[PDB]
Amino acid sequence: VNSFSGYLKLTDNVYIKNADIVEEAKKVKPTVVVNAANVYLKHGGGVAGALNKATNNAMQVESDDYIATNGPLKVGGSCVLSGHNLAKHCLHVVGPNVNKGEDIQLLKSAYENFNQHEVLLAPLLSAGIFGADPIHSLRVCVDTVRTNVYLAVFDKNLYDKLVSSFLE
Ligand SMILES: Nc1ccc2oc(=O)ccc2c1
């Protein structure tokens, strides 16, 4: 469990790797994988869609049941559901969608949810269709998360920009 390999330590507790988060979950067998969720837990693309596809749609079926029973999450909020074949747990975290006018200050609230878990495999929050600057998202992660977070970034050019941002 939690067999993280080949990460670069950026801070006392934040690590980064140029990797596919689904292939990392399969290799590492983490206690927790973080999903970059939306408030209705509709896993239609990006990391959410990739995680769901790797679970053979189990995540989406579980999420649909959760939302019909319990209602939507809030921006900045989270829920813990099954990790299925990826992890023990999946922490579904909703970062703000600034492309849709939501407040970037809620990215702090989103990352605060990571402090309820000793170690996490995670993507950067509010990246991709959520529209936040990835360098800013890494900064908020570093400033907010105090537990051990292993970040997976798929795209090499973005990984390099983030690592350079950070150590040069
Ligand atoms: N001190 C240190 C630095 C980097 C690391 O990256 C890993 O993949 C596993 C543990 C680790 C420990």
PDB file of C-alpha atoms and ligand atoms in Angstrom:
ATOM      1  CA  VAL A   1       0.000   0.000   0.000  1.00  0.00           C
ATOM      2  CA  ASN A   2       1.134   3.597  -0.745  1.00  0.00           C
ATOM      3  CA  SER A   3       4.148   2.378  -2.828  1.00  0.00           C
ATOM      4  CA  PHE A   4       4.898   5.807  -4.402  1.00  0.00           C
ATOM      5  CA  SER A   5       7.962   5.638  -6.712  1.00  0.00           C
ATOM      6  CA  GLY A   6       9.923   8.282  -8.602  1.00  0.00           C
ATOM      7  CA  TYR A   7       8.336  11.390  -7.024  1.00  0.00           C
ATOM      8  CA  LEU A   8      10.187  14.703  -6.700  1.00  0.00           C
ATOM      9  CA  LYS A   9       9.902  16.268  -3.226  1.00  0.00           C
ATOM     10  CA  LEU A  10       8.926  19.957  -3.676  1.00  0.00           C
ATOM     11  CA  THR A  11       8.276  20.807   0.024  1.00  0.00           C
ATOM     12  CA  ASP A  12       8.274  18.952   3.361  1.00  0.00           C
ATOM     13  CA  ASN A  13       4.964  17.267   2.388  1.00  0.00           C
ATOM     14  CA  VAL A  14       4.240  17.850  -1.362  1.00  0.00           C
ATOM     15  CA  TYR A  15       5.661  15.504  -4.011  1.00  0.00           C
ATOM     16  CA  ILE A  16       5.180  15.552  -7.802  1.00  0.00           C
ATOM     17  CA  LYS A  17       5.534  13.103 -10.724  1.00  0.00           C
ATOM     18  CA  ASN A  18       5.008  13.312 -14.463  1.00  0.00           C
ATOM     19  CA  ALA A  19       2.547  10.411 -14.628  1.00  0.00           C
ATOM     20  CA  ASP A  20      -0.992   9.209 -15.460  1.00  0.00           C
ATOM     21  CA  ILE A  21      -2.974   9.188 -12.153  1.00  0.00           C
ATOM     22  CA  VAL A  22      -4.834   5.986 -13.208  1.00  0.00           C
ATOM     23  CA  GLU A  23      -1.552   4.095 -13.845  1.00  0.00           C
ATOM     24  CA  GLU A  24      -0.189   5.484 -10.556  1.00  0.00           C
ATOM     25  CA  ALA A  25      -3.310   4.287  -8.623  1.00  0.00           C
ATOM     26  CA  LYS A  26      -2.913   0.781 -10.135  1.00  0.00           C
ATOM     27  CA  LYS A  27       0.849   0.572  -9.239  1.00  0.00           C
ATOM     28  CA  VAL A  28       0.824   2.424  -5.861  1.00  0.00           C
ATOM     29  CA  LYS A  29      -2.402   0.966  -4.348  1.00  0.00           C
ATOM     30  CA  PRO A  30      -2.947   4.198  -2.370  1.00  0.00           C
ATOM     31  CA  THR A  31      -5.154   4.492   0.674  1.00  0.00           C
ATOM     32  CA  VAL A  32      -6.770   7.533  -1.011  1.00  0.00           C
ATOM     33  CA  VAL A  33      -7.034   8.775  -4.587  1.00  0.00           C
ATOM     34  CA  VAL A  34      -8.447  12.303  -5.073  1.00  0.00           C
ATOM     35  CA  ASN A  35     -11.000  12.939  -7.790  1.00  0.00           C
ATOM     36  CA  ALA A  36     -11.306  16.401  -9.328  1.00  0.00           C
ATOM     37  CA  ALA A  37     -15.112  16.296  -8.984  1.00  0.00           C
ATOM     38  CA  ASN A  38     -18.059  18.538  -9.764  1.00  0.00           C
ATOM     39  CA  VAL A  39     -20.956  19.084  -7.364  1.00  0.00           C
ATOM     40  CA  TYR A  40     -23.234  16.489  -9.036  1.00  0.00           C
ATOM     41  CA  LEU A  41     -20.388  13.862  -9.200  1.00  0.00           C
ATOM     42  CA  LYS A  42     -20.861  13.510 -12.961  1.00  0.00           C
ATOM     43  CA  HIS A  43     -17.527  12.113 -14.141  1.00  0.00           C
ATOM     44  CA  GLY A  44     -17.713  13.213 -17.797  1.00  0.00           C
ATOM     45  CA  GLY A  45     -14.066  14.005 -18.670  1.00  0.00           C
ATOM     46  CA  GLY A  46     -10.591  14.810 -17.431  1.00  0.00           C
ATOM     47  CA  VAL A  47      -9.316  12.989 -14.343  1.00  0.00           C
ATOM     48  CA  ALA A  48     -12.905  12.239 -13.191  1.00  0.00           C
ATOM     49  CA  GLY A  49     -13.756  10.508 -16.469  1.00  0.00           C
ATOM     50  CA  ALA A  50     -10.422   8.621 -16.500  1.00  0.00           C
ATOM     51  CA  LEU A  51     -10.833   7.390 -12.901  1.00  0.00           C
ATOM     52  CA  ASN A  52     -14.432   6.354 -13.608  1.00  0.00           C
ATOM     53  CA  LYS A  53     -13.459   4.492 -16.815  1.00  0.00           C
ATOM     54  CA  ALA A  54     -10.678   2.621 -14.907  1.00  0.00           C
ATOM     55  CA  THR A  55     -13.375   1.492 -12.335  1.00  0.00           C
ATOM     56  CA  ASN A  56     -15.482   0.076 -15.234  1.00  0.00           C
ATOM     57  CA  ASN A  57     -18.165   2.730 -14.412  1.00  0.00           C
ATOM     58  CA  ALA A  58     -18.480   1.547 -10.775  1.00  0.00           C
ATOM     59  CA  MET A  59     -17.595   5.093  -9.606  1.00  0.00           C
ATOM     60  CA  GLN A  60     -20.384   6.719 -11.677  1.00  0.00           C
ATOM     61  CA  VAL A  61     -23.013   4.168 -10.547  1.00  0.00           C
ATOM     62  CA  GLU A  62     -21.981   4.729  -6.863  1.00  0.00           C
ATOM     63  CA  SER A  63     -21.903   8.545  -7.382  1.00  0.00           C
ATOM     64  CA  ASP A  64     -25.394   8.597  -9.019  1.00  0.00           C
ATOM     65  CA  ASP A  65     -26.779   6.681  -6.037  1.00  0.00           C
ATOM     66  CA  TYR A  66     -25.000   9.017  -3.561  1.00  0.00           C
ATOM     67  CA  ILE A  67     -26.362  12.187  -5.258  1.00  0.00           C
ATOM     68  CA  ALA A  68     -29.940  10.887  -5.663  1.00  0.00           C
ATOM     69  CA  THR A  69     -29.956   9.974  -1.920  1.00  0.00           C
ATOM     70  CA  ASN A  70     -27.930  12.857  -0.409  1.00  0.00           C
ATOM     71  CA  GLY A  71     -27.997  15.796  -2.923  1.00  0.00           C
ATOM     72  CA  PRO A  72     -25.086  17.718  -4.515  1.00  0.00           C
ATOM     73  CA  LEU A  73     -21.814  18.708  -2.839  1.00  0.00           C
ATOM     74  CA  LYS A  74     -20.801  22.365  -2.306  1.00  0.00           C
ATOM     75  CA  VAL A  75     -17.888  24.076  -4.041  1.00  0.00           C
ATOM     76  CA  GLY A  76     -14.859  23.603  -1.789  1.00  0.00           C
ATOM     77  CA  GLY A  77     -16.446  20.497  -0.273  1.00  0.00           C
ATOM     78  CA  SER A  78     -15.721  16.769  -0.531  1.00  0.00           C
ATOM     79  CA  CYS A  79     -17.091  13.305   0.140  1.00  0.00           C
ATOM     80  CA  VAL A  80     -15.318   9.958   0.655  1.00  0.00           C
ATOM     81  CA  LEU A  81     -16.676   7.109  -1.470  1.00  0.00           C
ATOM     82  CA  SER A  82     -15.198   3.753  -2.494  1.00  0.00           C
ATOM     83  CA  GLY A  83     -11.765   3.682  -4.163  1.00  0.00           C
ATOM     84  CA  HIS A  84     -12.989   0.615  -6.128  1.00  0.00           C
ATOM     85  CA  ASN A  85      -9.992  -1.032  -7.868  1.00  0.00           C
ATOM     86  CA  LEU A  86      -7.874   2.180  -7.612  1.00  0.00           C
ATOM     87  CA  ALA A  87      -7.537   2.837  -3.881  1.00  0.00           C
ATOM     88  CA  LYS A  88      -9.185   2.024  -0.617  1.00  0.00           C
ATOM     89  CA  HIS A  89     -11.055   5.379  -0.712  1.00  0.00           C
ATOM     90  CA  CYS A  90     -11.821   8.043  -3.327  1.00  0.00           C
ATOM     91  CA  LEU A  91     -11.924  11.594  -1.937  1.00  0.00           C
ATOM     92  CA  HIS A  92     -14.137  13.510  -4.373  1.00  0.00           C
ATOM     93  CA  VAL A  93     -13.151  17.195  -4.011  1.00  0.00           C
ATOM     94  CA  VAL A  94     -14.885  20.106  -5.755  1.00  0.00           C
ATOM     95  CA  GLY A  95     -12.593  22.971  -6.662  1.00  0.00           C
ATOM     96  CA  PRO A  96     -14.100  26.205  -8.037  1.00  0.00           C
ATOM     97  CA  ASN A  97     -14.824  26.371 -11.761  1.00  0.00           C
ATOM     98  CA  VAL A  98     -13.556  29.881 -12.523  1.00  0.00           C
ATOM     99  CA  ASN A  99     -14.500  29.374 -16.203  1.00  0.00           C
ATOM    100  CA  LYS A 100     -18.127  29.400 -14.779  1.00  0.00           C
ATOM    101  CA  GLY A 101     -17.624  32.454 -12.508  1.00  0.00           C
ATOM    102  CA  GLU A 102     -17.002  30.563  -9.221  1.00  0.00           C
ATOM    103  CA  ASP A 103     -14.633  32.163  -6.709  1.00  0.00           C
ATOM    104  CA  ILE A 104     -10.958  31.107  -6.907  1.00  0.00           C
ATOM    105  CA  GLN A 105     -10.664  31.701  -3.119  1.00  0.00           C
ATOM    106  CA  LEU A 106     -12.576  28.393  -2.675  1.00  0.00           C
ATOM    107  CA  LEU A 107      -9.542  26.537  -4.018  1.00  0.00           C
ATOM    108  CA  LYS A 108      -8.106  26.893  -0.476  1.00  0.00           C
ATOM    109  CA  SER A 109     -11.248  25.277   0.933  1.00  0.00           C
ATOM    110  CA  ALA A 110     -10.986  22.475  -1.658  1.00  0.00           C
ATOM    111  CA  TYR A 111      -7.367  21.643  -0.721  1.00  0.00           C
ATOM    112  CA  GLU A 112      -8.165  21.847   3.031  1.00  0.00           C
ATOM    113  CA  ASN A 113     -10.075  18.583   2.605  1.00  0.00           C
ATOM    114  CA  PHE A 114      -6.736  16.813   1.945  1.00  0.00           C
ATOM    115  CA  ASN A 115      -5.747  17.410   5.644  1.00  0.00           C
ATOM    116  CA  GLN A 116      -8.269  14.721   6.726  1.00  0.00           C
ATOM    117  CA  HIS A 117      -6.029  12.009   5.141  1.00  0.00           C
ATOM    118  CA  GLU A 118      -2.437  11.185   6.059  1.00  0.00           C
ATOM    119  CA  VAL A 119      -1.375  10.461   2.480  1.00  0.00           C
ATOM    120  CA  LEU A 120      -3.087  11.058  -0.866  1.00  0.00           C
ATOM    121  CA  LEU A 121      -2.531  10.480  -4.585  1.00  0.00           C
ATOM    122  CA  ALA A 122      -4.038  13.561  -6.261  1.00  0.00           C
ATOM    123  CA  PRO A 123      -4.310  15.737  -9.334  1.00  0.00           C
ATOM    124  CA  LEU A 124      -3.981  19.507  -9.212  1.00  0.00           C
ATOM    125  CA  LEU A 125      -7.414  20.963  -8.423  1.00  0.00           C
ATOM    126  CA  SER A 126      -9.331  23.490 -10.569  1.00  0.00           C
ATOM    127  CA  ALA A 127      -7.087  22.662 -13.604  1.00  0.00           C
ATOM    128  CA  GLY A 128      -8.360  21.825 -17.118  1.00  0.00           C
ATOM    129  CA  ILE A 129     -11.980  22.829 -17.692  1.00  0.00           C
ATOM    130  CA  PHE A 130     -12.155  24.458 -14.203  1.00  0.00           C
ATOM    131  CA  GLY A 131      -9.869  27.214 -15.561  1.00  0.00           C
ATOM    132  CA  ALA A 132      -7.470  28.038 -12.660  1.00  0.00           C
ATOM    133  CA  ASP A 133      -3.818  28.646 -13.434  1.00  0.00           C
ATOM    134  CA  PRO A 134      -1.977  25.366 -12.673  1.00  0.00           C
ATOM    135  CA  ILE A 135       1.033  27.161 -11.128  1.00  0.00           C
ATOM    136  CA  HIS A 136      -1.411  28.994  -8.790  1.00  0.00           C
ATOM    137  CA  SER A 137      -3.191  25.676  -7.939  1.00  0.00           C
ATOM    138  CA  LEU A 138       0.200  24.073  -6.974  1.00  0.00           C
ATOM    139  CA  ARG A 139       0.944  27.147  -4.794  1.00  0.00           C
ATOM    140  CA  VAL A 140      -2.401  26.873  -3.002  1.00  0.00           C
ATOM    141  CA  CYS A 141      -1.796  23.101  -2.513  1.00  0.00           C
ATOM    142  CA  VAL A 142       1.682  23.788  -1.019  1.00  0.00           C
ATOM    143  CA  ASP A 143       0.329  26.550   1.250  1.00  0.00           C
ATOM    144  CA  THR A 144      -2.810  24.669   2.411  1.00  0.00           C
ATOM    145  CA  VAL A 145      -2.075  20.915   2.582  1.00  0.00           C
ATOM    146  CA  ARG A 146      -0.017  19.757   5.555  1.00  0.00           C
ATOM    147  CA  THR A 147      -0.498  15.947   5.110  1.00  0.00           C
ATOM    148  CA  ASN A 148       1.493  14.039   2.482  1.00  0.00           C
ATOM    149  CA  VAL A 149       0.275  14.667  -1.067  1.00  0.00           C
ATOM    150  CA  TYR A 150       1.658  12.926  -4.182  1.00  0.00           C
ATOM    151  CA  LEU A 151       0.617  14.935  -7.249  1.00  0.00           C
ATOM    152  CA  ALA A 152       0.437  13.289 -10.675  1.00  0.00           C
ATOM    153  CA  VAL A 153       0.663  15.614 -13.721  1.00  0.00           C
ATOM    154  CA  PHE A 154       0.135  13.877 -17.095  1.00  0.00           C
ATOM    155  CA  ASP A 155       1.434  16.505 -19.572  1.00  0.00           C
ATOM    156  CA  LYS A 156       5.284  16.806 -19.722  1.00  0.00           C
ATOM    157  CA  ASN A 157       5.281  20.493 -20.802  1.00  0.00           C
ATOM    158  CA  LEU A 158       2.989  21.430 -17.899  1.00  0.00           C
ATOM    159  CA  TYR A 159       5.010  19.259 -15.421  1.00  0.00           C
ATOM    160  CA  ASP A 160       8.208  21.072 -16.466  1.00  0.00           C
ATOM    161  CA  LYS A 161       6.510  24.499 -16.101  1.00  0.00           C
ATOM    162  CA  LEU A 162       5.312  23.539 -12.594  1.00  0.00           C
ATOM    163  CA  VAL A 163       8.687  22.131 -11.413  1.00  0.00           C
ATOM    164  CA  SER A 164      10.600  25.142 -12.906  1.00  0.00           C
ATOM    165  CA  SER A 165       8.022  27.571 -11.376  1.00  0.00           C
ATOM    166  CA  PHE A 166       8.875  25.938  -8.124  1.00  0.00           C
ATOM    167  CA  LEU A 167      12.691  25.209  -7.866  1.00  0.00           C
ATOM    168  CA  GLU A 168      14.304  27.794 -10.277  1.00  0.00           C
TER     169      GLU A 168
HETATM  170  N1  LIG B   1      12.281  11.750   1.099  1.00  0.00           N
HETATM  171  C1  LIG B   1      11.554  11.314  -0.073  1.00  0.00           C
HETATM  172  C2  LIG B   1      11.680  12.044  -1.282  1.00  0.00           C
HETATM  173  C3  LIG B   1      10.975  11.630  -2.416  1.00  0.00           C
HETATM  174  C4  LIG B   1      10.153  10.493  -2.351  1.00  0.00           C
HETATM  175  O1  LIG B   1       9.405  10.056  -3.559  1.00  0.00           O
HETATM  176  C5  LIG B   1       8.785   8.767  -3.595  1.00  0.00           C
HETATM  177  O2  LIG B   1       8.341   8.365  -4.611  1.00  0.00           O
HETATM  178  C6  LIG B   1       8.710   7.957  -2.342  1.00  0.00           C
HETATM  179  C7  LIG B   1       9.145   8.561  -1.099  1.00  0.00           C
HETATM  180  C8  LIG B   1      10.036   9.777  -1.152  1.00  0.00           C
HETATM  181  C9  LIG B   1      10.750  10.208  -0.019  1.00  0.00           C
END
